[PDB]
Design a protein around this ligand. Structure first.
Ligand SMILES: C[S@@+](CC[C@H](N)C(=O)[O-])C[C@H]1O[C@@H](n2cnc3c(N)ncnc32)[C@H](O)[C@@H]1O
Ligand SMILES: C[S@@+](CC[C@H](N)C(=O)[O-])C[C@H]1O[C@@H](n2cnc3c(N)ncnc32)[C@H](O)[C@@H]1O
Lengths: 401, 404
């Protein structure tokens, strides 16, 4: 309903490959691209994909306040939005994770009535989970900016994951082309010593930024971070992962109210699902092949799909259109403008496929692309009111479930 | 050296478009693909990219324990790894975020001496930050699985973001094709009432799973979650976001030790950097264009890049090879095996480009791809240290920083 749009997208952390297909598609479709990325291969890639790019990094300077820079970056984007253009902003990682100017620009554009969207990307924390072989679900995850962690005295949980961004320049972090002096690093180490003890592990993590490099996953004690040669390794792309120090016990009241007792008691609080977190101090070895695991594996020989399983049964024409809607922003905009008129223009759809697309309905799309068996709908009819998507994947964190 | 590998990748949350370029490239290059995705368009897309796919979802069944299913899913992948094949596992979102079988399979493969890697993807939490317009950095973020949150009595912080996954089946969540019965949801609501009060907002979040659908971003009070017509909207793809109830003050000792002085007038604890979190209750309106913002904008007219700014200055041949290494897993494997032989096979590189690639050094690559000015290297050489990457982007969360 008004000309002009702002879409902010991420590149991910590792050069080129961690960009999403949709982020690429918006970069190619844009009238104007504004980017801020440290990696030159990623910068070069972006410039091959759009003819009208501006490097936002040129608005930093020595002794020029970051906030003034962020104001300038956002204003450069919003000015093009105001002139009626489809503008794309590009930042490293996930563009809304530990980033100032993306949020500012989107809020401004939205407040003046323009279309404004952030697209998610792969963050440094996403990379951390992948490279350290941890899951934030087990046993929960606290994530802070290191200076904020200190200044606001943010609480830690010794029973959960802790991730600290921006450990490489605690306190004042004035822009400087020839680098930070992390002269207040000891204030962070002090806090870590108070919370965890001098012998507790801290993992220095740096995701590889090129496809070929290995990640830095260096474990140190809190005490070792005081050594000058170790402290010097922590720079502007360093993140700290602090593993839990202990395992939290279960709450008897909740166990009862959730009916997890079979007139009997749960797994011991250290009776872990394989694999254990390898960074956790004094982590005991967990057996991957218990008798129950071996029995489950034995059943694979006799396995067939359950009668309620819904095999995919689609067509080239339908997969092509669903792919086009995900990868062509213009096609998506058109479809959202008028489901019918779009659905009518698509070649080679069956009547069901056309109808489902026209209708705007997840269930219709599912039926069009999956063979739904009688035993599923008979069970969905005999119990309840109407059928929908069910049978969800689900992480088990507590041993009982 | 040992034959066989396992790479586990994500699809992201929204159909197709949230898969990474590298996830796609590994799916295409794999000898065998094992996938577990709910979205049929994503399943169809995967099947068009590799000829040898297996749907892991078929190993679920009614009243069959999920742990047994996960054991089976892992074992199917690891069997093909032990046979010396390049195997790819595909799960929704980020394949290591709230997922059991990926971690099991990788840990087994790795313990038996096979190459094993997880590639990150876009999670439902990444989607949540983007759709709710929040930054986990401001003012920190706590993330839990809902049943674990309750059973282990995990702490909340009323001053930070809280994100809860799997709110649609609190407690026993046995597999059922016709869906969960969320009859213990009240146990979660009681906990939220105790921690936050009955009138505090909870945001029911469901990311759009078709490119065209819109996100669900519905704000309710904790009390409203007890209404049957509201509680029934919560399902298997629901996540809750609970915004902070208050702003935390600064610590005077830390202010001093970090030298964020003088006078005793740091920014007030509610003096926010624009924009404010719109979900936070009684959030005061923040001014986007303060006098200093207007002055910064006035300087745009006379702006030129500083002396130390490094323009990109590369070639078609160099951007091509760097792109190939990011997008072609075979090409990358060759390059890592022998930098020199790979770099000498590459057509049309200049001597420096060739040389930088032979070395495998971030800094050599940067010099080959950017024009480094004298002002920058004269500053590095005056220090007595070789130049490296500096001038990092940095989020400002504490308002005192940025005022200095
Ligand atoms: C201003 S933030 C930007 C984060 C980015 N938007 C993201 O999605 O992660 C900079 C901080 O992110 C983290 N970071 C950036 N690159 C990284 C890397 N290669 N490895 C580990 N952490 C990184 C560090 O904590 C760094 O100080
Ligand atoms: C087994 S987990 C898997 C998460 C996935 N690996 C990821 O990266 O987010 C399932 C939970 O993820 C969250 N989730 C999955 N799809 C979602 C969506 N479309 N919107 C919001 N949350 C979602 C919900 O909390 C759901 O209960």
């Amino acid at each position: 309903t008004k000309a002009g749009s702002l879409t902010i997208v991420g590149t991910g952390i590792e050069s080129i490959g961690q960009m999403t297909l949709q982020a690429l598609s918006y970069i190619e479709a844009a009238a104007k691209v504004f980017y801020c990325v440290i990696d030159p291969a990623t910068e070069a890639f972006i410039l091959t994909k759009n003819k009208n790019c501006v490097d936002l990094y040129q608005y930093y300077d020595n002794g020029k306040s970051r906030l003034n820079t962020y104001t300038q970056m956002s204003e450069l984007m919003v000015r093009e939005v105001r002139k009626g253009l489809d503008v794309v902003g590009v930042f490293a990682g996930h563009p809304g994770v530990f980033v100032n100017p993306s949020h500012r620009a989107l809020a401004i554009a939205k407040s003046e009535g323009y279309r404004a969207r952030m697209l998610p990307g792969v963050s440094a924390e996403d990379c951390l989970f992948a490279d350290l072989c941890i899951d934030p679900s087990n046993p929960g995850c606290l994530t802070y900016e290191a200076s904020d962690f200190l200044i606001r005295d943010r609480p830690v949980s010794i029973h959960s994951h802790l991730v600290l961004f921006q450990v490489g320049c605690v306190g004042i972090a004035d822009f400087n082309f020839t680098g930070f002096d992390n002269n207040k690093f000891g204030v962070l180490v002090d806090r870590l010593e108070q919370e965890y003890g001098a012998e507790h592990p801290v993992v220095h993590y740096i995701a590889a930024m090129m496809p070929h490099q290995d990640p830095v996953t260096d474990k140190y004690t809190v005490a070792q971070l005081r050594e000058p040669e170790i402290a010097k390794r922590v720079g502007g792309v360093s993140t700290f992962y602090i593993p839990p120090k202990a395992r939290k016990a279960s709450n008897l009241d909740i166990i009862r109210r959730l009916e997890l007792l079979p007139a009997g008691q749960v797994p011991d609080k250290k009776a872990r699902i394989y694999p254990a977190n390898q960074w956790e101090p004094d982590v005991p070895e967990v057996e991957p092949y218990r008798p129950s695991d071996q029995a489950a594996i034995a059943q694979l020989a006799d396995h067939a799909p359950p009668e309620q399983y819904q095999p995919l049964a689609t067509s080239k024409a339908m997969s092509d259109v669903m792919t086009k809607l995900a990868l062509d922003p213009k096609a998506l905009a058109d479809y959202k403008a008028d489901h019918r008129a779009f659905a009518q223009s698509v070649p080679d759809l069956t009547p069901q496929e056309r109808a489902a697309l026209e209708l705007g309905d997840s269930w219709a799309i599912r039926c069009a692309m999956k063979n739904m068996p009688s035993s599923l709908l008979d069970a969905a009819r005999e119990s309840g009111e109407e059928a929908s998507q069910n049978g969800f994947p689900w992480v088990i964190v507590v041993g009982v479930i």
